[PDB]
Structure formats: structure tokens, C-alpha cells
């Protein structure tokens, strides 16, 4: 709510290193758009979105507002490019979940060593707990094939794979589990390919968002690292 | 062969991390198959094989069975995709090698930290030796070019280079040298490229084996890391 | 300089790791060359240039002559493959800078822990400063869109960004800032997109320079790390 609050969330408790990379990420994004003012949409979709995931990596709650903008726009822009896997995913799943996420995260916040901001309390699945979730996804793959037969189905397999994985990832994330980042690393190497092949069928893609997914991949390694530090801050000792 | 053994070898002394990844790798391989049951053959070549390399990372000697399955199936699958460089690599090189490797590793297994299972004893090349190993690889390339002049060759360079690099890594790996992992990281980047071209000449590549190799690269870093730990543990 | 001094410069104060990845970076380049004596030009461009950037990484000064050879041959070669953003960047901007650079670094050398070689004294920007430098990059982009407008521009958006970013990185290098390597990590990822599209239009690319930029990416990460050590040694 508070501007004083907004000041904390946005500027509070970044390391130098986190600051450098975020600023450079917005820079490359600014510089790509000061070349292509025409696709202003996808460039907004990157800037809000780079901020979304960098904030998740930090465990900041105000990621969700950014996410809400970002996934919506992206949903449109991924349609205008005939990436149908990404379009139904962002619109139907990510857009409601932004609020759902804000709900359940909101309940589980905490200070962090500078106390200049609030970080979510991160949890760690066990191997057993994990082996279930992996199976869950393979089960619900057959369920994502049954569904979506309706209206026929026009999902190439790979456009398809990146979609199960993305839902499972999103689900661990709202649930505050560190293992989400292992999944995010796979959804990011996959979506980069999606926008890279899209540049051949038909011979086209959008640079702000293909570039966005490269910055996503980097950050998703940061996320895994930082979320580990986070899981310890709230554990056995 | 002991059953109690295969229990240790297969499930013993994994970190939460290694576990969390090796499972997520197999899951993604599975989700891929629940989409295209059509070529299980490749999906199996991927599943057996992720395990191969994940097990070499660990210094686990049972890596060799998984490899034997993996490389043979792989040799076939790359043959159906006109990657004739790779199919001959697996067939003439890797398939006999699982055996030679198993031979030499077995004499140099050690306990490892939890005593829950055993690891190969890793060694480190020196800068001198490594320079020599690398020098060999260029000298040895003119030999791989003279050979294969015979029986003809549309040896595209990319396919060709990765075949030389792969042979040298394999030799170091059987010989239990850490530095294989450096070479592995490069053969993985090269081979990701082979399957990335295979879908322009022409239009069709295998997904499980494209994915397999992305995962191979991830793991080849863990490999490097983990073998440095192995070198410390055993001298 | 002396023959005693050149022994220190080229062989002085390498970690076993840096040494292994260096000799191998050169090995893999040599091999792509034993396959295609066809254009050694790109190969010499690759070899010096790997040496250039590993040398920048180590904070060594004779990176500069290597850079000089590298950026020339390359600037030419990036012309013969019709990559015009890259050719103008290397010739007009880099060849001057190799000189400016040697001038400036020369003032700020220091020894470093083994007392073998001379490392440059690394500094770091603050977040405040970093904010300017990035915002500067944004202004200077529309200002480089003015400049280029005269006599037209066959500048794809991609090529255009990678020239902006590459200059800003090179300004940071000459001024001796650790933060250069974040930029380089982006230009190296961008320049592999460039030589990847160059393959498609028109149906052509050079392996030694596509490899070299993959080896650049690896080394640009090592760069960031070692320059962090390097800032710490010098307050
Ligand atoms: C969208 C806003 C995020 C961009 C990066 C902002 C980084 C602010 O950096 C700030 O610098 C100060 C040190 O001088 C520290 O006290 C703060 O903890 C730190 O957050
Ligand atoms: C081919 C075998 C694939 C499965 C490997 C992951 C299985 C988990 O592995 C095991 O989990 C236990 C958790 O209590 C640990 O105590 C064991 O040391 C560990 O090896
Ligand atoms: C991209 C590949 C990542 C490899 C990083 C693994 C760490 C290997 O680095 C190792 O560090 C040791 C001391 O710590 C040294 O004794 C070894 O010479 C060196 O190879
Ligand atoms: C670019 C010219 C050669 C590449 C670097 C060669 C690496 C040599 O590295 C050297 O190896 C010796 C180990 O015996 C050490 O004594 C030296 O301190 C070390 O710097
Ligand atoms: N790196 C990622 O893909 C990532 C990481 C953390 C959270 N998310 C969420 O997914 C969507 C973007 O892909 C957003 O809704 C994020 O909240 C993505
Ligand atoms: N990551 C790799 O590419 C890798 C790692 C370790 C061993 N290998 C060998 O290649 C075959 C597996 O496909 C086997 O022979 C491995 O010994 C490859
Ligand atoms: N890895 C890089 O991109 C890098 C790092 C440090 C310096 N440089 C300079 O760019 C050119 C190399 O192609 C040379 O001028 C380098 O000095 C590049």
C-alpha cells in the first residue's frame, strides 16, 4: 500500500551484483526498443517480466503486480506470432495465479538480514516428495492430451512439453518451494527454442521476448542459488 | 552382480541435489515420450544414457551397463538421421569401449565419504601432460583424415571435429583423468549443434536426443565439479 | 621488452585450470583448422583473439598486440560473410582502441600473488555510476542512429544493439572496470546469434569464428570471476 512501502519493495536490500545485472537487463531491453519503437508491446512485456522474475528470485512479493502486466501482454504477443502453446498458458493459467500467488505468499513473509525489505519464506521438498511431483507431471501430461483434444489439437510436441513443465513450476513457486528453479531452468531453455524456431515458421520472431527468455535463463540460475540461501534462512540451524 | 549391491550402486549416496536433478531429467524425458510414443527407441536411448553420464559424474562403475544400452540404440537412431559421423562413433568406438572401461575402472574403485557406495579413483593431468594430450589430438587428426579417405567421406567438418574430441575424452575417462570433463563440455556443445542442423538438412530431428544432449551439458559441469572432489579424496 | 619479461608475460602466473582451458581452447581451434586449411585466415583470427580475451581475463597487458592481429583479420572476415555491423565495429572502433588501451593500462600494472606476471589494477563501478553508464548507452543509441542515417544503413536491429553494447563494454575495459564482463557476456551471446543467422542468409558461416565466440562466452564468465578477485587484490 504505502509509498514508503513501495520505496522498500523497489529499492530495498539489493546486493550490488543483483543491481548491476537487473540494470543491464533493462538497458539491453531499452536499447533494443530505441531501435524498434513499433513493437512497443513486446518491449513493455519484457521490461515488466524481467522485473517479475528477478523479484521472484529475490523472493519479493511485488513480483506479482509486474507478473500480471507482463504475462497478459506476452499472451497477446505470443498469439500475434502463432505461438499457441505460450498464449493459452499465460492467459488461462498465469493470469489468475498472479492473485492466487499474492494471496498465499502474502501470508508467509519475513524481514531478511538488512531488514530493508521483506522476503518470502522458502521451503525445500525432499527427494521422495519430489519423485511424486515428477510423476504427477507425467500423469497430467496424458490429462493435457485428453483435454485440448476439444477444438481439435494443434500443439507441436515441444510447444507442448514446455507447457506441462511451466504449470508444475508455477505451482511449486506459489507454494514457496525452492525446487521450482530446477524446473524454470528447463522452461527457459525450451521457450528460447520456441521463439528461435518461430523465426522460421514463418521466418519471423520478436527480439524483445526472445532476448527476454535469455535473460530469464540467467536469472533462473540466480533464483536457484538465492532461493537456496533463502531456504536456509528459515530452517533447522 | 550381487542384488544387495545393485541396491547400493543404483540408490546409494546421492546428494539431495544430484537426486533432484537426475530425477527431473528423467521426468522431462518421460513427458517427451507421453507426447510421442512413436519413437520410443530414441526415448529409451535418452533415458539409458542420462543415467550413463550422471553415473560417470558420480564415478559409479555401473555406468557402463547403462552406456552399453545407450550407445548402441543411439548409434542406430543417429543413423536414421543421416548423422553418419555419430553412428560410427558409437558403434565402432563406444560399444567396445564400455567393456574396456569396465575392465580398468574395476581395479581402481574406492570407498567414498558415506561408505554407502564406492567411487572410481580420479586422477589429474599436469599442464605438461595436458599440452601433450592436446598435441596428440591435432597430430592424431591427420590420421583420422587419411583413414576414412578410404570407403569415401562426406565428412562434414562439424561432425568430424566432434568425433576426434569425443575419442580423446573417452580415452581420458577410461583412464580416470578429471580433465575428460573439459573435453566433454565441448563435445556436448558441438553435438547439440549436429542435432540442431539435422532439422535444416532436412526438416527433421529427434527431440529426445536433442534434449538428452542439453542435459548432458548441464551434467558435464557437475561432472567437472565432482571429479575435482574425487581427485582430492584419493590423493 | 626483455626475453626475461616475455617469459613472465606468456607463461607467468596461470592457475592449472586456466592453463587447461587455454591449451584446449587452442587445440579445438587447431583441429577445426586441420580439417579446413581452406581458410586459415579465420583460424589465425580465432587463435589470436582467444589469446586476446583470455589475456584480458588474466589482466595481462600483451593482450593488446594479440587483439590488434585478431580484430583486423576478423574485421576483414566478418566482411566476407556480409556481417556489416561487426566489420565496422572492429575496424573503426577496435583497431584504434588496441592502441588507446595499451597506452592507458600500461600506467596501472601491479604484481599479484605469485610474483610472476603483472596484473592490471581492477576497479569497480558503484550502482549509482552503473545507472549513468547504462542510461548513457540508451541516449548514445539514438545518437548513433543519427550518425548511421547518413549514406543509409543495412543494419539489422540485432547487429545494431551488439555494436552499441560492444563499445560500452570496450570503454569499461579501457577504463579498467570489472563491470565490463557483464556487457561482454551479453555481446558474446549476441555475436553467436549473429554468426548463427549469417549461416542462414546467405547459407554461410565460418566455424572458427562461431567456435571462437562460444569460447569467448566461456571465458567472459571466467573473466567476471577473476576480475572480482582482481578488484579485491587492489583494495
Ligand atoms: C526497479 C528498481 C531496482 C533497480 C536496482 C536498484 C538497486 C538499489 O541499490 C541500493 O543501493 C544502496 C547502496 O548504495 C543500498 O543501501 C540498497 O540496499 C540497495 O538496494
Ligand atoms: C538410478 C537411480 C535414480 C534415483 C536416484 C535418487 C534416489 C535417491 O537417493 C537416495 O535418497 C536417500 C534419501 O533418504 C538417501 O539417504 C540416499 O543416500 C540417496 O542415495
Ligand atoms: C565450466 C566448468 C566448471 C569447472 C569448475 C570446477 C572447479 C575446477 O577447478 C579446479 O579447482 C581446484 C582447486 O579448487 C584445482 O586444484 C584444480 O586445478 C582445478 O581444475
Ligand atoms: C599463451 C602461451 C602459453 C599458454 C599458458 C601455458 C600455461 C603455463 O602455465 C604455467 O605452468 C607451470 C606449471 O609447470 C607453472 O609453474 C607456471 O606458474 C604456470 O603459469
Ligand atoms: N524464470 C522463469 O521462467 C520464472 C521464474 C519465476 C516465476 N515465473 C512466473 O511465470 C511467469 C513468467 O514465465 C510469471 O507469472 C512468473 O510469476 C517464471
Ligand atoms: N557428458 C558426456 O558427453 C559424457 C560424459 C561421460 C562419458 N561419456 C561417454 O560417451 C558415452 C555416453 O554417451 C559413454 O561412452 C561415456 O563413457 C560422455
Ligand atoms: N570476451 C569478450 O567479448 C571480450 C572481453 C574483453 C575484451 N574484449 C575486446 O574485444 C575484442 C575481442 O574480439 C578485443 O578488442 C578485446 O580487447 C572482448
* Angstrom distances, CA of residue C228 to CA of B147, B200, C179, C181, C231: 48, 42, 9, 10, 5
Q: Specify whether the CB–CB gap between A124 and A227 falls below 8 A.
A: no
Kind and range of the H or E run holding B109 = strand B109-110
| Neighbouring residues of B101: CB distance < 8 A, sequence distance ≥ 6 | B64, B173, B174
Decide: A195 and A215 in contact? Cβ < 8 Å.
no
**Residues on chain A touching C157 (C-beta within 8 angstroms):** 32, 35-36, 207
For chain B, the 3-state helix, strand and coil shares in percent, each to the nearest 5, are 75, 5, 25
What is the Cα–Cα distance from C214 to C217, expressed in whole angstroms? Answer: 5
- Contact residues on chain A for C183, CB-CB shorter than 8 A: 24
Q: Are A20 and C179 in contact (CB under 8 A)?
A: yes
C212 touching B, CB under 8 A? Answer: no
Half-sphere exposure of C40 (CA within 13 A, CB side): 2
Torsion of CA A204, A208, A209, A211, to 10 degrees: 100
C12 CB within 6 A, ligand 4: yes
B139 in C contact zone (CB under 8 Å): no
* Burial category of C175 from C-beta neighbours within 10 Å (exposed 0-12, middle 13-18, buried 19 and up): middle
Q: Flag if B157 and C36 touch (Cβ within 8 Å).
A: yes
CB atoms within 10 A of CB A162: 23
Q: Do B134 and C24 touch (CB under 8 A)?
A: yes
CA distances from B235 to B40, B48, B107, B216, B224 (A): 43, 32, 16, 28, 17
> How much is the CA Rg of chain A, to the nearest whole Å?
18
Per the annotation, binding residues of C for beta-nicotinamide D-riboside are 98, 170, 184, 188, 216
Residue C9, domain extent: 1-235
Residue B86: CB atoms within 10 Å: 24
Q: Please, are residues C177 and C125 in contact by the beta-carbon 8 Å criterion?
A: yes
**Taking CA C60 as the corner, what is the angle to CA C56 and CA C61, rounded to the nearest 5 degrees?**
95
Cα(A113)–Cα(A201) distance, integer angstroms: 49
For C208, phi then psi, to 5°, come to -65, -30
Helix (H, G, I), strand (E, B), or coil: what is residue A77? helix
Which pairs with CB-CB distance under 8 Å and at least 24 residues apart come from C130-135? C130/A19, C130/A20, C130/A23, C130/A24, C130/C179, C131/A23, C133/C168, C133/C172, C133/C179, C134/A23, C134/A24, C134/A26, C134/A27, C134/A30, C135/A27
Tally of structural domains, chain A: 1
Q: What resolution (Å)? A: 2.8
Measure in Å the smallest separation between the Cα of C97 and chain B Cα atoms. 32
Name the closest ligand to CA B63. 6
Q: If you count DSSP H runs as helices and E runs as strands, how many of each does chain C have, helices first?
A: 10, 2
Torsions phi, psi for C148 (to 5 deg): -75, -30
After which residues does chain A have a break in its backbone, defined as C to next N over 2.5 Å?
none
Task: Inspect the interface and report whether the beta carbons of B32 and A157 lie closer than 8 Å.
Answer: yes
Solved with: X-ray
Closest by alpha carbon to A81, among A28, A45, A53?
A45
Rounded distance between C-alpha atoms, residue C9 and residue C3, angstroms: 10
Cα gap A67→B220, rounded to integer Å = 34
Note whether C83 and C156 are within 8 A (CB).
no
Please give the distance, rounded to the nearest whole angstrom, from the Cα atom of residue A236 to the centre of ligand 2. 21
C-alpha neighbours within 13 Å on the C-beta side of residue C123: 13
Which mutation among B182, B228, B234 tests ligand 3's pocket best, with the greatest number of atoms within 8 A of CB? B228
The length of chain B is 235
Which residues are near ligand 2 (CB < 6 Å)? A 127; B 10-14, 19, 22, 51, 116
User: Using the beta-carbon criterion (under 8 Å), do C161 and A32 form an inter-chain contact?
Assistant: yes
Amino acid at each position: 500500500g504505502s509509498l514508503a512501502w513501495w520505496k522498500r519493495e523497489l529499492f530495498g536490500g539489493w546486493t550490488h551484483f543483483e543491481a548491476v545485472w537487473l540494470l543491464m537487463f533493462l538497458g539491453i531491453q531499452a536499447v533494443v526498443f530505441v531501435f524498434n519503437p513499433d513493437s512497443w508491446l513486446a518491449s513493455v512485456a519484457a521490461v515488466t517480466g524481467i522485473l517479475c522474475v528477478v523479484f521472484v528470485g529475490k523472493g519479493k512479493i511485488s513480483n506479482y503486480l509486474f507478473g500480471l502486466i507482463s504475462v497478459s501482454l506476452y499472451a497477446y504477443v505470443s498469439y500475434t506470432f502463432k505461438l499457441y502453446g505460450e498464449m493459452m498458458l499465460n492467459l488461462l493459467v498465469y493470469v489468475p495465479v498472479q492473485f492466487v500467488g499474492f494471496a498465499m505468499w502474502r501470508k508467509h513473509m519475513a524481514l531478511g538480514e538488512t531488514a530493508e525489505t521483506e522476503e518470502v519464506k522458502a521451503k525445500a521438498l525432499t527427494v521422495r516428495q519430489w519423485l511424486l511431483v515428477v510423476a504427477a507431471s507425467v500423469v497430467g501430461t496424458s490429462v493435457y492430451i485428453e483435454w485440448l483434444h476439444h477444438l481439435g489439437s494443434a500443439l507441436p510436441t515441444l510447444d507442448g512439453v514446455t507447457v506441462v513443465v511451466s504449470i508444475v513450476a508455477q505451482v511449486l513457486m506459489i507454494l514457496r518451494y525452492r525446487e521450482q528453479w530446477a524446473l524454470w531452468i528447463v522452461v527457459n531453455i525450451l521457450t528460447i527454442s520456441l521463439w528461435a524456431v518461430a523465426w522460421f515458421k514463418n521466418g519471423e520472431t520478436s527480439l524483445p521476448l526472445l532476448l527476454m527468455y535469455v535473460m530469464y535463463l540467467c536469472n533462473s540460475v540466480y533464483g536457484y542459488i538465492n532461493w537456496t540461501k533463502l531456504v536456509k534462512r528459515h530452517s533447522g540451524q
